[PDB]
Amino acid sequence: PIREQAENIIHLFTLTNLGAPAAFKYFDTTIDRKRYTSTKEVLDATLIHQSITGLYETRIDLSQ
DNA sequence: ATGAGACGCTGGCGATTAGCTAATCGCCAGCGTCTCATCTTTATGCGCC
């Protein structure tokens, strides 16, 4: 039914939530958390030194 | 002429689970012949505008 599928579509949003990844379920399908076990890709990413309203963005290209 | 709005351990381990070039050196390399002819070219030796 449509209602249950809506509730479980709602359940799926925690995967797209901001922040730490935590587990959840869709019906009986336990959907675990996707942890990022390697931090090598950050080393050549873009450092974002930040400000309280997110209006004043200062960006640093981590290539030095 | 009342009954909604306020939703979790995760990070830091082990310990699986999975998977990959690279640096060093050594080995070891298809080869055998003949015939036949064919042309060149070189060393030396001989001549004045």
From Swiss-Prot:
Disruption phenotype: Loss of correct processing of pre-crRNA and tracrRNA. Loss of immunity against a plasmid with homology to CRISPR spacer sequences. A motif (PAM substrate-binding) lies at residues 33-35. Coexpression of Cas9 with an artificial single guide RNA (sgRNA) which fuses the crRNA with the tracrRNA in human cells has shown it is possible to target and modify DNA sequences of interest. Cas9 plus the 2 sgRNAs have also been expressed individually in human and mouse cells to achieve DNA targeting; cleavage efficiencies of the artificial sgRNA were lower that those for systems with the 2 sgRNAs expressed separately. Microinjection of Cas9-encoding mRNA and a synthetic sgRNA into zebrafish embryos induces targeted mutations. Mn(2+) 3 binds at D28. Disulfide bonds: none annotated. Monomer. Binds crRNA and tracrRNA. Belongs to the CRISPR-associated protein Cas9 family. Subtype II-A subfamily. Has 2 endonuclease domains. The discontinuous RuvC-like domain (approximately residues 1-62, 718-765 and 925-1102) recognizes and cleaves the target DNA noncomplementary to crRNA while the HNH nuclease domain (residues 810-872) cleaves the target DNA complementary to crRNA. CRISPR (clustered regularly interspaced short palindromic repeat) is an adaptive immune system that provides protection against mobile genetic elements (viruses, transposable elements and conjugative plasmids). CRISPR clusters contain spacers, sequences complementary to antecedent mobile elements, and target invading nucleic acids. CRISPR clusters are transcribed and processed into CRISPR RNA (crRNA). In type II CRISPR systems correct processing of pre-crRNA requires a trans-encoded small RNA (tracrRNA), endogenous ribonuclease 3 (rnc) and this protein. This is CRISPR-associated endonuclease Cas9/Csn1. It comes from Streptococcus pyogenes serotype M1. The lineage of its organism: Bacteria, Bacillati, Bacillota, Bacilli, Lactobacillales. The chain holds residues 1301 to 1364 of 1368 of the full protein.
